[PDB]
Amino acid sequence: SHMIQAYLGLGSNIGDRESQLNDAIKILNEYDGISVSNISPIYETAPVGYTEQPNFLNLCVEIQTTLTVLQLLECCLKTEECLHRIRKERWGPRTLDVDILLYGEEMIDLPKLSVPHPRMNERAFVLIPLNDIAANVVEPRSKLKVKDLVFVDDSVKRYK
Ligand SMILES: Nc1nc2nc(S)n(CCO)c2c(=O)[nH]1
């Protein structure tokens, strides 16, 4: 029951993107061991990786959690599988990504999981919305607080 403060990164680029983010937050907070305590603004971001796909909506969430980072990962995975289910086949699959960004001030390096991801520092679609809710949290790989990692990126803009 020692509570860890974690940050998650959420994204959806196809379907009702905002409603997808919204549901993921709700589902995560429904776990006995997770309490959603803050949410960033939503940002519309240009796709990173494949450039030929729709824009994402991204946000980040602060949680107070008594789960271990792997149990938290489980909750993330279950939430993805759940909001991926088709609504109507002809509409196609729905989308949602939920990543653990920060878990207390710990560096976690397991074969199935790295928290923070070592390349998270590259991602404005993460850092910008992260900075709205975790500006003063130290990202342990770099040793920089999130407010000092965040950089200018015009491909990321507030959505509402
Ligand atoms: N802008 C942006 N690009 C992305 N590429 C992938 S893959 N993803 C899914 C997150 O890993 C995203 C994303 O959430 N936002």
The experimental resolution of this structure, in angstroms, equals 1.9
Count of domains observed in the chain:
1
The residue range of the domain holding 159 is 1-160
Residues touching ligand 1 (Cβ under 6 Å) are: 11, 45-49, 56, 58, 97, 99, 125
How far does the centroid of ligand 1 lie from the alpha carbon of residue 5, in Å? 23
For the chain, the residue count is 160
Scanning 16-85, the segments in alpha helix (DSSP H) are: 17-30, 69-84
**Residue 41 is part of a domain; what is its CATH number?**
3.30.70.560
**How many other CB atoms sit within 10 Å of the CB of residue 57?**
24
Please state, in angstroms and rounded to a whole number, the distance separating the CA atoms of residues 12 and 116.
20
Technique used by the depositors: X-ray
Amino acid at 83: L
Please state, in angstroms and rounded to a whole number, the distance separating the CA atoms of residues 72 and 41.
22
Q: CA of 109: how far to CAs of 7, 70, 74, in Å?
A: 17, 11, 16
Please state, in angstroms and rounded to a whole number, the distance separating the CA atoms of residues 94 and 22.
13
Please state, in angstroms and rounded to a whole number, the distance separating the CA atoms of residues 57 and 11.
6
Question: To test ligand 1's pocket by mutation, which of 13, 96, 159 has the most ligand atoms within 8 angstroms of CB?
Answer: 13
